[PDB]
Design a protein around this ligand. Structure first.
Ligand SMILES: *c1nc(C)n(CCO)c1N
Ligand code: NA
Length: 165
């Protein structure tokens, strides 16, 4: 699978993950510099959205709304991952008026990038995460997987919402 950024084309680094595969539980760092496991204990629908950069991203703007709608749904969690440090993530998020959003950094181990196969290879965005969304069940099996072909574009909104019906 190839991802594009203006005149650049990326080979995705890490292990390829398919619908039906058990996604591995990975270590990430939260806004309190606490190490957390990606997979929430018991939650039936786990949305995991990965961004190259939180800074001025479309996902950050709609994060507060989507987090509300998912929160009210039964057993649906919403996690946003980037290579951004937690401090920057906390201030970016805080500045947009997004409270209690599970924004997590992959900076320490690059465990999400490597295990979900979305670590961008050689190029200007090398070592950043490809724009991607996963839905995992309580068991960590991949219900839905989308990796955007154009890193600047957003995942299919329709297709994501339909999975949460
Ligand atoms: C970030 N990434 C995704 C897929 N979302 C949900 C739609 O806005 C956000 N907020
Ligand atoms: Na999608």
């Amino acid at each position: 699978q190839k991802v594009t950024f203006k005149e650049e084309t990326y080979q995705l680094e890490g292990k390829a993950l398919k619908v039906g595969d058990k996604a591995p539980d990975v270590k990430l760092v939260n806004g309190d510099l606490q190490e957390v496991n990606l997979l929430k204990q018991g939650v039936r629908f786990q949305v995991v959205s990965a961004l190259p950069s939180l800074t001025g991203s479309v996902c950050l703007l709609q994060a507060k709304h989507f987090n509300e709608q998912t929160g009210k749904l039964p057993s649906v969690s919403f996690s946003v991952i980037s290579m951004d440090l937690p401090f920057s993530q906390g201030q970016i998020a805080g500045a947009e008026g997004i409270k209690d959003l599970r924004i997590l950094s992959d900076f320490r181990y690059k465990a999400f990038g490597e295990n979900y196969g979305v670590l961008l290879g050689k190029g200007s965005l090398q070592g950043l995460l490809a724009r991607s969304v996963f839905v995992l069940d309580d068991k960590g099996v991949v219900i839905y997987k989308e990796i955007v072909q154009n890193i600047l574009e957003e995942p299919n909104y329709e297709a994501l919402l339909k999975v949460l019906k």
